[PDB]
Design an enzyme around this catalytic site. Structure first.
Site, PDB file in Angstrom:
ATOM      1  N   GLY A 122       0.847  -1.167   0.000  1.00  0.00           N
ATOM      2  CA  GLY A 122       0.000   0.000   0.000  1.00  0.00           C
ATOM      3  C   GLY A 122       0.890   1.226   0.000  1.00  0.00           C
TER       4      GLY A 122
ATOM      5  N   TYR B 234      -4.202  14.889   2.185  1.00  0.00           N
ATOM      6  CA  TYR B 234      -3.629  15.671   3.263  1.00  0.00           C
ATOM      7  C   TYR B 234      -4.251  17.058   3.309  1.00  0.00           C
ATOM      8  CZ  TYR B 234       0.025  12.102   3.162  1.00  0.00           C
ATOM      9  OH  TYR B 234       0.711  10.906   3.173  1.00  0.00           O
TER      10      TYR B 234
ATOM     11  N   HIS C  82      12.796  13.959   5.373  1.00  0.00           N
ATOM     12  CA  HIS C  82      12.714  12.535   5.100  1.00  0.00           C
ATOM     13  C   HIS C  82      12.952  12.202   3.638  1.00  0.00           C
ATOM     14  CE1 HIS C  82       8.639  13.770   3.887  1.00  0.00           C
ATOM     15  NE2 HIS C  82       8.591  12.652   3.184  1.00  0.00           N
TER      16      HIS C  82
ATOM     17  N   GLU D 108      11.481   8.986   1.009  1.00  0.00           N
ATOM     18  CA  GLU D 108      10.294   8.141   1.006  1.00  0.00           C
ATOM     19  C   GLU D 108      10.639   6.770   1.553  1.00  0.00           C
ATOM     20  OE1 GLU D 108       7.313   9.632   0.306  1.00  0.00           O
ATOM     21  OE2 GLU D 108       8.821  11.237   0.323  1.00  0.00           O
TER      22      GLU D 108
ATOM     23  N   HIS E 201      13.495  15.885   1.692  1.00  0.00           N
ATOM     24  CA  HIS E 201      12.667  17.080   1.625  1.00  0.00           C
ATOM     25  C   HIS E 201      11.900  17.320   2.905  1.00  0.00           C
ATOM     26  CE1 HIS E 201      10.293  13.656   0.223  1.00  0.00           C
ATOM     27  NE2 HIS E 201       9.253  14.264   0.782  1.00  0.00           N
TER      28      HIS E 201
ATOM     29  N   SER F  14      -1.238  12.423  -2.542  1.00  0.00           N
ATOM     30  CA  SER F  14       0.080  11.905  -2.865  1.00  0.00           C
ATOM     31  C   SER F  14       0.117  10.384  -2.840  1.00  0.00           C
ATOM     32  CB  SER F  14       1.127  12.463  -1.901  1.00  0.00           C
ATOM     33  OG  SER F  14       0.973  11.905  -0.618  1.00  0.00           O
TER      34      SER F  14
HETATM   35  O1  LIG Z   1       2.366  17.411   2.194  1.00  0.00           O
HETATM   36  C1  LIG Z   1       2.925  16.723   3.089  1.00  0.00           C
HETATM   37  O2  LIG Z   1       2.434  16.411   4.202  1.00  0.00           O
HETATM   38  C2  LIG Z   1       4.332  16.194   2.784  1.00  0.00           C
HETATM   39  N1  LIG Z   1       4.361  15.519   1.511  1.00  0.00           N
HETATM   40  C3  LIG Z   1       5.382  14.789   1.130  1.00  0.00           C
HETATM   41  O3  LIG Z   1       6.435  14.585   1.944  1.00  0.00           O
HETATM   42  C4  LIG Z   1       5.347  14.110  -0.215  1.00  0.00           C
HETATM   43  O4  LIG Z   1       4.271  14.325  -0.916  1.00  0.00           O
HETATM   44  O5  LIG Z   1       6.286  13.388  -0.624  1.00  0.00           O
HETATM   45 NI    NI Z   2       7.649  12.856   1.187  1.00  0.00          NI
END
Ligand SMILES: O=C(O)CNC(=O)C(=O)O
Ligand code: NI
Ligand SMILES: [Cl-]
Ligand SMILES: [Zn+2]
Length: 338
Positions: free
Chosen positions: A163, A170, A181, A183, A269, A281
Site C-alpha cells: 500500500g 492531506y 525525510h 520516502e 525534503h 500523494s
Molecule cells: O504534504 C505533506 O504532508 C508532505 N508531503 C510529502 O512529503 C510528499 O508528498 O512526498
Molecule cells: Ni515525502
C-alpha cells in the site's frame, strides 16, 4: 545533466503531459532528479476534478496536533491525535484567528514567520487519509493508478507492494509541517495540490543526502543512538538557517494550487503548508529506483515500518546481477546523476 542541482519547473503542453511515465522519463533526461525534487505545472485546461464542493463533507478520522519542541532551527516533532472532524469543520478551524495564516509581505517573509512561531500554537494536520478525490475517468496523471514498475510487480507477479502505491489525502493549515525525510524504501513520490493555500518545500540533492544525515546525527546523537535510520520517523526539523551555516546544499520552492511536485529516490525534503489546503500523494517506482531500494537504510527501532522485498525487482529487471546480488557480491556506489 542539471549540474547546479536546482529544483526544475516544467510547463508541459497537453500533448507532452498526457503520459505521466513518458514525461517523467523526459524530466530525468533533463537532470530533474539531481535536485531531489521537481515541479510540474499541468496545462490550464486539465482538471482532475470539476467540482470540489462535496469534499467539504469528507470525514477526517484522525486529525493530528503537531507538537514541536526545540530551539534555534533544531526541533523534534510529536503527534497528539484529536477527535474525528469533517473537512468543513477543519476548514473553519484553519481559518479562525487561532490557526489562520499571519499577514505577510511575500513567501520569504512567511517562511520567516513559520520558523519563528513553530513553538507557539500547535497546528492540526489532517494527514494520511486513504483515498483519492480525482473524478472517475481521469486517465492523465491519476495518482491512484500510475502504472509504474511498482504496479507491474503487484499485478503481474503477485507481490505485496505494501500500500505504498495507494493514494493519500492531506488537509493542511498554516504551520502544519513535514519533517526531513526520504520516502519509504527511498521511493519516488508525487504530490498534487488540489486546492487552497500553497505548500513550501525544501530539498536536498540525493548526491548530498549523506551530509544531511551526518549533520542530523551530530544534532540528535540521542535519536541516532537508538536508530540507524531515525530520520525515517519523520520527527526531525532542521531550518535552512542551520543548513546554510553548516554548508548543506539545498533549494526551496513553493507549490501552488493545481501544481504537481515529484520527489526523487533519496531526495530529502521537508516543508510546511501556508494555510488551508488539500493535497493528494502516493509513492511510485522506476527501474532507476531499484538500486536505491536495494541499498536503503531502514528503521531498526520499530515493528511495523514499511519494508519491500527487492528480490522480484532485481530478478525481473536486473537479471544480469540477480545471482551476484543474492550472493552479497553486488557491490556498488550510486551515481545520482545518471
Ligand atoms: O504534504 C505533506 O504532508 C508532505 N508531503 C510529502 O512529503 C510528499 O508528498 O512526498
Ligand atoms: Ni515525502
Ligand atoms: Cl504565526
Ligand atoms: Zn527507527
Amino acid at each position: 545533466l542539471n549540474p547546479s542541482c536546482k529544483i526544475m519547473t516544467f510547463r508541459p503542453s497537453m500533448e507532452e503531459f498526457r503520459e505521466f511515465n513518458k514525461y517523467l522519463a523526459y524530466m530525468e533526461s533533463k537532470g530533474a532528479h539531481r535536485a531531489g525534487l521537481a515541479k510540474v505545472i499541468p496545462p490550464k485546461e486539465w482538471k482532475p476534478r470539476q467540482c470540489y464542493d462535496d469534499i467539504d463533507n469528507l470525514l477526517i478520522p484522525a486529525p493530528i496536533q503537531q507538537m514541536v519542541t526545540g530551539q534555534s532551527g533544531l526541533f523534534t516533532q510529536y503527534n497528539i491525535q484529536k477527535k474525528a472532524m469533517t473537512v468543513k469543520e477543519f476548514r473553519q478551524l484553519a481559518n479562525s484567528g487561532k490557526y489562520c495564516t499571519p499577514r505577510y509581505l511575500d513567501y520569504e517573509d512567511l517562511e520567516r514567520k513559520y520558523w519563528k512561531n513553530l513553538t507557539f500554537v500547535a497546528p492540526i494536520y489532517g494527514a494520511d487519509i486513504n483515498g483519492s478525490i480525482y473524478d472517475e475517468g481521469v486517465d492523465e496523471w491519476n495518482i491512484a493508478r500510475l502504472n509504474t514498475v511498482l504496479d507491474v510487480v503487484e499485478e503481474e507477479c503477485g507481490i505485496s507492494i505494501e500500500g505504498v502505491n495507494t493514494p493519500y489525502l492531506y488537509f493542511g493549515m498554516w504551520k502544519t509541517t513535514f519533517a526531513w525525510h526520504t520516502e519509504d524504501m527511498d521511493l519516488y513520490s508525487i504530490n498534487y495540490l488540489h486546492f487552497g493555500e500553497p505548500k513550501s518545500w525544501y530539498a536536498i540533492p540525493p548526491e548530498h543526502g549523506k551530509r544531511l544525515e551526518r549533520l542530523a546525527q551530530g544534532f540528535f546523537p540521542s535519536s541516532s543512538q537508538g536508530c540507524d535510520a531515525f530520520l525515517r520517523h519523520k520527527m526531525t526539523l532542521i531550518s535552512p538557517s542551520v543548513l546554510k551555516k553548516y554548508g548543506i546544499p539545498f533549494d526551496k520552492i513553493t507549490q501552488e494550487a493545481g501544481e504537481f511536485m515529484i520527489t526523487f529516490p533519496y531526495g530529502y525534503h521537508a516543508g510546511f503548508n501556508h494555510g488551508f489546503n488539500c493535497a493528494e500523494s502516493t509513492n511510485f517506482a522506476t527501474v532507476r529506483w531499484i538500486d536505491y531500494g536495494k541499498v536503503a537504510k531502514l528503521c531498526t527501532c520499530r515493528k511495523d515500518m514499511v519494508k519491500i522485498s527487492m528480490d522480484i525487482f532485481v530478478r525481473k529487471f536486473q537479471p544480469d546481477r540477480y545471482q551476484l546480488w543474492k550472493q552479497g557480491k553486488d557491490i556498488y556506489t550510486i551515481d545520482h546523476t545518471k
